[PDB]
Amino acid sequence: SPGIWQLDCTHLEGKVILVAVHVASGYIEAEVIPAETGQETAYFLLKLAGRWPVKTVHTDNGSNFTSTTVKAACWWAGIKQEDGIPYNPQSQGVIESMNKELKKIIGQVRDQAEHLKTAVQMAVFIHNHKRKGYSAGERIVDIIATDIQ
Amino acid sequence: SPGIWQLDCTHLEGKVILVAVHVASGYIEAEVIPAETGQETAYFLLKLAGRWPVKTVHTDNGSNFTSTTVKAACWWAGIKQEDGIPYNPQSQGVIESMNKELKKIIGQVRDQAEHLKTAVQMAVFIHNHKRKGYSAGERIVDIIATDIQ
């Protein structure tokens, strides 16, 4: 569980926001892309796994699960690629609530940014620093440090 | 010291690799951009500061120190922008060695990637996971967790 992340893809402004969630902390990383392709997903996972110790990724849909480019990135970076079936039905609800919260934040910053990619990064920043008590960014560092020790 | 990062800009293949180094651990994040503008530098620092608790950034040159776009991102994200004057001459040496190491890694992977951006993320991943004993990715999490406690 320190190594487990969930991919999540949401839409806004005719564009696609790809999100990775560190499940045990709620910490996120995200990017804006024109469309979700296996190549964009593969590159985003290579980036994530060079930055945090990613052991397992639950893919966001069957096309990224199937995609051989996504499988090649997971092989390269040492990630176990898994499906994202919510065997726990609470998983579904947690992701939907996250997407609605991110979109709310993005609307609160949206007029400070010309481009959507800035607004999304401002929303990642606000989400990860929000104290709910500890922030998501504090929780993920604590979890991983505990694991390393 | 847990919060201090140094920007560093290096060139390859007619393109610019922008790097942020966490000084106490040697951990890095990096991106490829066409050229090093205050807008690209500002966006890169917004990204970094949403992912780690960035307290201080030593800018890589006087143009990004001066840039009002960079100062506006540092204001937005709560970052103290500082100069990168190597009052400790050891600093120039460490950065130069890091650029030569990264370029070495990039040439070791370069044929596995069509685009330079991929090879650079593969080199981030190799750099951060290399045990020298702990890796840089282990050191940065331990340092910051120690700080949070």
Place this chain on the structure above:
Amino acid sequence: SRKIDNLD
């Protein structure tokens, strides 16, 4: 443009 990412 009066934006963080476009000060113009």
Place this chain on the structure above:
Amino acid sequence: SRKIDNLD
């Protein structure tokens, strides 16, 4: 292309 980022 026989590349991680371009399997073609």
